[PDB]
Ligand binder design. Structure first.
Ligand SMILES: Nc1ncnc2c1ncn2[C@@H]1O[C@H](COP(=O)(O)OP(=O)(O)OP(=O)(O)O)[C@@H](O)[C@H]1O
Ligand SMILES: Nc1ncnc2c1ncn2[C@@H]1O[C@H](COP(=O)(O)OP(=O)(O)OP(=O)(O)O)[C@@H](O)[C@H]1O
Ligand SMILES: [Mg+2]
Ligand SMILES: [Mg+2]
Lengths: 514, 47, 464, 464, 49
């Protein structure tokens, strides 16, 4: 044991090099509100990581004739006039590598979790060009979010940008953490072509929220493959601005090496606010909602690196799940509409439904997965292809039913079917379901087998039926898993077991659901 | 009875319309403040 | 001789030249970035002269790693894009560098992307109708062959779906050539469109130029002109009929606003560039057809924050023969293609150009829908039950008309499965005449969604 | 080594220092005004470094009477607040100078008001209930230990009585301490609060920090941080659970906005400072539980224009975990602590954190009270007899449920004499389970008034 | 402030004073004018911070 302790320090001592080289040292002539002007540094690169003497760093944005304007990252309260500023010979870049798996790192890759340094393979520039049009292929394989609503109605495909969006306290981080946790079954396979690594970039979230998300991931074994880039609300605007870019860099290193990544950005609205701060402190004129004209460029530059590469570039992918905090369901505001224009579909989590008890509060009709359907296992597509329109129609019809004395028999049937399907989709927190379970549960409702069950008991009927199947006719689950199709033989078996159960199922009123 | 139901629906729709119009009014108020500040600070920046 | 980079402000680079070698406006300059991770030959476009032999340039590639004091060599000519029959069937970037195979097009004729729009003497207003097969467009907003078309929309309304729908309607059977310009849209959409055209065998007749979102404002504003130069080469040098799709033209003005705030030009009304009208005009005016040579154009326009009064849409409205204003309200009703029947307009909706019956039916439909909009307040609070009987019947057939304008577009297949249908103009006119007269006030509303045709209407009515 | 005042523009003061002696950001500098009527020792907080060894500072005191060229002496440390057991029972300003006994606390340990939040590794990953012992709070609006509680209020709704009650409970149940930060506090209301706490005999367990409204924006912005520094000392040194009141947090935001305007920063959003979220994080994130000791906080949040989408509340409410709203409706009916069961809410009230039984009983109580509120219109217009048997039963049960959420608050001991009540959490859960099942519906309404728990209910009923 | 001064002299001497201001919006506009003529930075509605 002591041998390794001595050997590591011995290697450090012997490897120490008297590196006497040439550093261009400049001097700060001004500093305030996260911006520092540095005269000198005649050979500085635009967006270079200048290193100020307090250990803090800065990104050189404006290279004027007199001086360099640097956005300071982190504790700018240490900066003062006259301090030496040293180059670092690296354009804005972050370390990347497999060592980041299971580490909470501030937006520059410096670990904050308290564990040791990170063995970075290399450094990646935060501003590398996204894959060109000819370097992609349409997303062709699913990313099972573990949520019946998302994986049935608006599926997320590997390489897709699915924008979770909704008011405060509406179940967004819950959906993202659930989709991170659900990937453990794939991670354990040990197959890079199927493993899904994760990166959770918290922008402006409270420290306690990041701690809770980390605990939720740890309890579900998700820290073996999940990185956290924490730019808490305490950090300055610079960290909140470039946290998504460092998360995207960590993810891109793996994406270009043939692996699959799931980048969550929580919230990109807090990145936009931090960039508004940086730009206005730089006196760049504001635009709509006081944002700079290039906020769209910020978010698109970010999310356009989330792609499904071609087989010629390793066939890797990076799925983005940006979270946008709307204000009072203003989906037409500036930042929401931007991120919708960049992303490939939105899951709108309505607050009225969240308070009403419908969790996750997926607002049907407004929610859609543009490049969905293609990335969805054939069983789920055959069983849930029509679910979104049916649920939206039920929502439209509920307003009429809320005031109608009586309705057409067809309208009554649709109202009932919707009132059972919405209860079926509802799901408890941190309780992801494998794809087989999701397809069976959605099959129960879409094919009408729930129509005999009272609404209030649907949750139990499904919840227990999956248990009944789970160890009485596991042939169904294994068939779905291996074949990924709901074969007619398996469908007949499934309806047989559903009826066998319904005979023995007792509702809350004591009535049989036969 | 139909009048009770119809006017309950009308009150609910009026409340929802009031909420939506208040949200729109608040957003327009914020937009007016932002635009006014933009004009003032643009004038300042040109001295 | 060569200049010298003197200051860098994001994608804007100021370069100081010798007293006697200042480059002209819109001249292409070459700088170098040597940092290995992202070393590249950086193209700049001179946008201003600042005195003391300085010239301020926009950057086509992202100015990362660029160092003060590096050499800048003027090429003596503006950014050039390749042209010829060769550009058909290939994907190019804003600077004319081919993407599907990098070494392509470096031996073709190269045209400067900056050229004055055709002289007024050669313009004449096109008025021939372009039957697309969609009910709403063919009835209320008849597109103009050889003319400019637009598709205004917020985020998530159906601009790109309808753009590729019209690629299927028009380009798929077009006799001439086509060009598609990705101006600040998704690279995923670019790849999907490329593969779709390859499968539909339309690629061999399309030249694709992309300036997608992941690129700096420079290329994001010059990609439109890069595509438009190939379009104009086809229009003039070859005499072929041309299509020119541009998705999305608002990204042009947004890149303009970014470069404006960087160049130091003061902010305009809502932060846009003061030259919004001029920058938009010098682009749109080139997309016009001339006497004997047609260039149909179809531009998606992003209406930011669903605000149709924004200066960018408010400027691009005046440049269009046919405007199709997609709206959120129609989208949330599920009425695709989501066209607001009232806001949209076409200049050929004149009884002398489309015919008496067509115009009469269109105007009656518009009247019904306008009265429905005027009754929307009472409909929202009280309900249809408290209206007058004439207004009640009008609202019923207004709902039926409004649903009937929906159509199962071909491009919608991927999203819905149900195949696409094309309703010939005569059937649309007859069907909407029948709806307005009240012949179908007895069928349920649900029988008109996404049906597209009288025969399909009868079949779906029987199904319900 | 000492500088000179070179510019005075209202609160903003610019100070020149020798070449290598410029003070660091947020250092506190002392200047002198020597005019007879306005003699003062100004505290200037360095806000920006302007170059040429000039520092722009926001004066914490009026600059009326300051003279150019007057010496400015640098303390070398940020605004220092006294911290200790001695700050209990005294009233301070944002600069640490005592107000009821001037010169006091100058020998105490001094702490910089600017200090980082707890490192990530030291945050508690699980949210834990703070069992206040008040039925209504512990049942329907469970406070999060180490969280922030919105405290809406007004005139006469008993906000100050609730503040006294929480000081009492945190000082007798948890063995902790309370700190009151008057961010923009009316001098009249400040005096009233001081005398009321002195009369309630809880001042000895409370440290008051007032940034009075008459003071420039600097003190109104820094008083929250000074009070939170006192709380952080009580937490991280004396091992006491602390309760930090902040009336009013929106005035912290407004002070930040005003200072931002003074320093020349371009206003953002709706006129608020660009760094709004950053400042709010620097303040709130220091209010958290670390190493088993927590600074709970109750913050009065003024929502401007009654708009929760306004940036100020929309940034405060990202950090608030629970909301307590006091209404005239509940208060006038004799129900103290005046907490509105329906408008109030809490983020910890999910079955995951609280027990499933607790969630069930809380939801049932909310349901019964919501139905009673729905029926109150009918009660007031048509008379109670208009109700059905089920509706009458529900109304009777809801009356007693809402009257049972009252409690003989410890703060009321000075008035009624009877000692306050601390209901155990599970005891409250069982009591409201029984009461929502009607087991106590036969008792008269007056029995439930101001009764602390289940056994006290019976022992008071026997008096009727 | 002149009114407040005249009032404060009586206030500190043991008398009771009542000060009316028709209208403080016109003081705010006056101070806005003075500040903007002095180039002091403007915030919301052009008012100095
Ligand atoms: N599917 C769910 N079922 C039940 N409760 C849920 C569900 N998802 C979230 N919650 C609960 O809702 C509350 C808020 O959840 P969450 O933090 O995910 O919301 P959010 O909108 O992302 O929040 P924020 O804006 O604060 O980050 C927590 O109590 C969480 O336990
Ligand atoms: N006719 C249709 N049928 C079914 N779904 C449709 C239809 N039109 C649009 N959609 C849905 O709406 C989404 C909107 O796609 P589209 O690319 O047109 O949106 P947009 O926001 O206008 O585009 P852009 O990102 O170019 O601004 C489609 O991906 C699909 O999900
Ligand atoms: Mg969250
Ligand atoms: Mg599109």
């Amino acid at each position: 044991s002591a041998a390794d302790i001595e050997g590591a320090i011995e290697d450090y001592v012997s490897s120490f090099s008297a590196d006497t080289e040439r550093e261009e040292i400049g001097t700060v002539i001004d500093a305030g509100d996260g911006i520092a002007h540095v005269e000198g540094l005649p050979s500085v690169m635009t967006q270079e990581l200048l290193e100020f003497p307090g250990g803090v760093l800065g990104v050189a944005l404006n290279l004027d004739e007199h001086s360099v304007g640097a956005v300071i990252l982190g504790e700018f309260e240490k900066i003062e006039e006259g301090q030496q500023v040293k180059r670092t010979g690296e354009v804005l870049s972050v370390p990347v590598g497999d060592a980041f798996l299971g580490r909470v790192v501030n937006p520059l890759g410096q670990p904050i979790d308290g564990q040791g340094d990170i063995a970075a393979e290399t450094r990646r520039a935060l501003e590398l060009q996204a894959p060109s049009v000819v370097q992609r292929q349409s997303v062709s394989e699913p990313l099972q979010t573990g949520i019946k609503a998302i994986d049935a109605m608006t599926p997320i495909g590997r390489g897709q940008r699915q924008l979770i969006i909704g008011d405060r306290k509406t179940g967004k981080t819950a959906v993202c953490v659930d989709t991170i946790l659900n990937q453990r079954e794939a991670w354990l396979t040990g197959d890079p072509k199927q493993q899904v690594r994760c990166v959770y970039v918290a922008i402006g979230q409270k420290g306690t929220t990041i701690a809770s998300v980390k605990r939720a991931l740890e309890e579900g074994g998700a820290m073996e493959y999940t990185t956290i880039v924490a730019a808490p609300a305490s950090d300055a605007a610079g960290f909140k601005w470039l946290a998504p870019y460092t998360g995207s860099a960590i993810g891109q290193h793996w994406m270009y090496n043939g692996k699959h990544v799931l980048i969550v950005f929580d919230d990109l609205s807090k990145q936009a606010d931090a960039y508004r701060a940086i730009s206005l402190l730089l006196r760049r004129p504001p635009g709509r909602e006081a944002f700079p004209g290039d906020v769209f460029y910020l978010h698109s530059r970010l999310l356009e690196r989330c792609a499904k590469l071609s087989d010629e570039l390793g066939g890797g992918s990076m799925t983005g799940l940006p979270i946008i905090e709307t204000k009072a369901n203003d989906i037409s505001a500036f930042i929401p509409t931007n991120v919708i224009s960049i992303t490939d579909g939105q899951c709108f989590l309505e607050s009225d439904l969240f308070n009403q008890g419908v969790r996750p509060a997926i607002n049907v009709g407004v929610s859609v997965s543009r490049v969905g359907g293609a990335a969805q296992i054939k069983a789920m597509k055959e069983v849930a292809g029509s679910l979104r329109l049916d649920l939206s129609q039920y929502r439209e019809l509920e307003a009429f039913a809320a005031f109608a004395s009586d309705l057409d028999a067809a309208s009554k049937a649709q109202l009932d079917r919707g009132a059972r399907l919405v209860e079926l989709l509802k799901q408890p927190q941190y309780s992801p379901l494998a794809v087989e379970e999701q397809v069976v549960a959605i099959f129960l409702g879409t094919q009408g087998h729930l129509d005999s069950v009272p609404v209030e008991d649907v949750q139990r009927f499904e919840s227990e039926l999956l248990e009944h199947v789970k160890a009485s006719h596991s042939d169904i689950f294994d068939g779905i898993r291996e074949t990924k199709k709901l074969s007619e033989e398996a469908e007949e078996k499934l309806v047989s077991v559903i009826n066998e159960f319904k005979k023995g199922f007792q509702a809350s009123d004591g009535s049989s659901v036969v | 009875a139909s009048r009770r139901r119809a006017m309950k629906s009308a009150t609910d729709n009026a409340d929802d319309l009031i909420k939506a119009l208040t949200l729109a009014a608040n957003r327009e108020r914020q937009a007016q403040i932002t635009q006014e500040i933009s004009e003032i600070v643009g004038g300042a920046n040109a001295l | 001789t060569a200049g010298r980079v003197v200051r860098i402000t994001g994608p804007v680079v100021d370069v100081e030249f010798p007293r006697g070698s200042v480059p002209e406006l819109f001249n292409a300059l070459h700088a170098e970035i040597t940092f290995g991770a992202l070393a590249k030959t950086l193209t700049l476009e001179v946008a201003q002269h600042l005195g003391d032999s300085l010239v301020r340039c926009i950057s086509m590639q992202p100015t990362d790693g660029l160092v003060r004091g590096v050499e800048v060599t003027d090429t003596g000519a503006s950014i050039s894009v390749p042209v010829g029959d060769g550009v058909k069937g290939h994907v190019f970037n804003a600077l004319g560098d081919c993407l599907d195979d990098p070494g392509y097009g470096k031996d073709f004729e190269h045209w400067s992307i900056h050229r004055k729009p055709p002289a007024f003497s050669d313009l004449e207003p096109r008025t021939e109708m372009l039957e697309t097969g969609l009910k709403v467009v063919d009835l209320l907003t008849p597109y103009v062959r050889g003319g400019k078309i637009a598709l205004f929309g917020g985020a998530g309304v159906g601009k790109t779906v309808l753009i590729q729908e019209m690629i299927n309607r028009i380009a798929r059977n077009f006799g001439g050539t086509s060009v598609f310009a990705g101006v600040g849209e998704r690279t995923r959409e670019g790849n999907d469109l490329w593969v779709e055209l390859a499968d539909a065998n339309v690629l061999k007749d399309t030249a694709l130029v992309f300036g997608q979102m992941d690129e700096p404002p420079g290329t994001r504003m010059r990609v439109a002109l890069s595509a438009l130069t190939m379009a104009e080469f086809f229009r003039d040098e070859q005499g072929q009929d041309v299509l020119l799709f541009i998705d999305n033209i608002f990204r042009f003005t947004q890149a303009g606003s970014e470069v404006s705030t960087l160049l130091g030009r003061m902010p305009s009304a809502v932060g846009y560039q003061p030259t919004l009208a001029d920058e938009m005009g010098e682009l749109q005016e080139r997309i016009t057809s001339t006497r004997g040579r047609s260039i149909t154009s179809m531009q998606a326009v992003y209406v930011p924050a669903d605000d149709y009064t924004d200066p960018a849409p408010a400027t691009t409205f005046a440049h269009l023969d046919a405007t199709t204003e997609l709206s959120r309200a129609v989208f949330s009703k599920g009425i695709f293609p989501a066209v607001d029947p009232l806001a949209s307009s076409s200049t050929i909706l004149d009884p002398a150009i489309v015919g008496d019956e067509h115009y009469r039916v269109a105007q009656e439909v518009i009247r019904i829908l306008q009265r429905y909009k005027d009754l929307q307040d009472i409909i929202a609070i009280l309900g249809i039950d408290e209206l007058s009987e004439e207004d009640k019947q009008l609202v019923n057939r207004a709902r039926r008309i409004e649903r009937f304008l929906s159509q199962n577009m071909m491009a919608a297949e991927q999203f819905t499965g149900q195949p696409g249908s094309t309703v010939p103009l005569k059937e649309t006119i007859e069907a909407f005449d029948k709806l307005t007269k009240g012949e179908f006030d007895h069928l349920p509303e649900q029988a008109f969604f996404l049906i597209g045709g009288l025969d399909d209407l009868a079949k779906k009515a029987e199904s319900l």
